[PDB]
């Protein structure tokens, strides 16, 4: 009811999200951040990215029968962050070992032979800083790529090589 949130996050409802049914709660301040890719289509406008966020949530809900879109946050090439399960709900993007001790953010697209535009890298880094600000992440939070906690090509070769340059990257 006062000014909106840091990181300018597109709220669940704005991208016509089916309502969440998840209950497990994340014990924030959380240690880790896991960067992955959706391996779906990429989009570069808010109209094309609201549609894509909807589509990723629907594959997770209708087909895998999950309680909500598996990722805590989604990032579109349009340069905006899309609210997934948010800062407080356990995710479903990294396995039983990690989901409980991580926030999962996922870049919408396949980044094996492509890179996300700087604005998508920007929205991401800012979403992470707006994390501690709120007090959802720990000050010295570590960033792991998907393929560092699980056997998978995610987040793609090109994007995986960028996030290693990030200051908080590890292992």
Ligand X SMILES: CCCCCC[C@@H](O)[C@H](CCCCCC)C(=O)O
6 token code pair: 């840091």
103 token code pair: 């926030």
Binding mask 81-120 for a copy of itself (x = CB under 8 A): --------------xxx--xx---------------xxx-
The least distance separating a copy of itself from the CB of residue 43, rounded to whole angstroms, comes to 10
CA pair distance 112, 83, nearest whole angstrom: 24
Residues whose CB falls within 8 Å of the CB of residue 21, separated by 6 or more in sequence, listed in order: 67, 68
CB 8 within 8 A of CB 80: yes
Q: Does 162 bind a copy of itself (CB under 8 A)?
A: no
The least distance separating a copy of itself from the CB of residue 103, rounded to whole angstroms, comes to 14
134 binds, among a copy of itself, ligand X, none (CB under 5 to 8 A by kind): ligand X
Residue matched to tokens 């309680």: 67
Binding mask 122-141 for ligand X (x = CB under 6 A): -------xx--xx-------
Helix, strand or coil for residue 132?
helix
105 token code pair: 């953010």
114 binds, among a copy of itself, ligand X, none (CB under 5 to 8 A by kind): none
Q: Does 6 bind ligand X (CB under 6 A)?
A: yes
Instruction: Give the binding site for ligand X (CB under 6 A).
Output: 2-3, 5-6, 129-130, 133-134
């Amino acid at each position: 009811e006062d000014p909106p949130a840091c990181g300018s996050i597109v709220p669940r409802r704005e991208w016509r999200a089916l309502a969440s049914e998840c209950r497990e709660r994340l014990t924030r301040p959380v240690r880790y951040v896991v960067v992955s890719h959706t391996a779906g289509s990429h989009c570069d406008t808010p109209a094309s990215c609201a549609q894509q966020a909807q589509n990723v949530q629907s594959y997770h809900v209708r087909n895998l029968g999950w309680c909500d879109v598996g990722y805590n946050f989604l990032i579109g090439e349009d340069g905006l962050v899309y609210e997934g399960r948010g800062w407080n709900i356990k995710g479903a993007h990294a396995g039983p070992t990690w989901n409980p001790i991580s926030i999962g953010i996922s870049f919408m697209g396949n980044y094996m032979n492509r890179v996300p535009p700087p604005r998508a890298l920007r929205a991401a880094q800012n979403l992470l800083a707006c994390g501690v600000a709120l007090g959802a992440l720990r000050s010295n939070y570590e960033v792991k790529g998907h393929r560092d906690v699980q056997p998978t090509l995610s987040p793609g070769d090109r994007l995986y090589e960028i996030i290693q340059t990030w200051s908080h990257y590890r292992a």
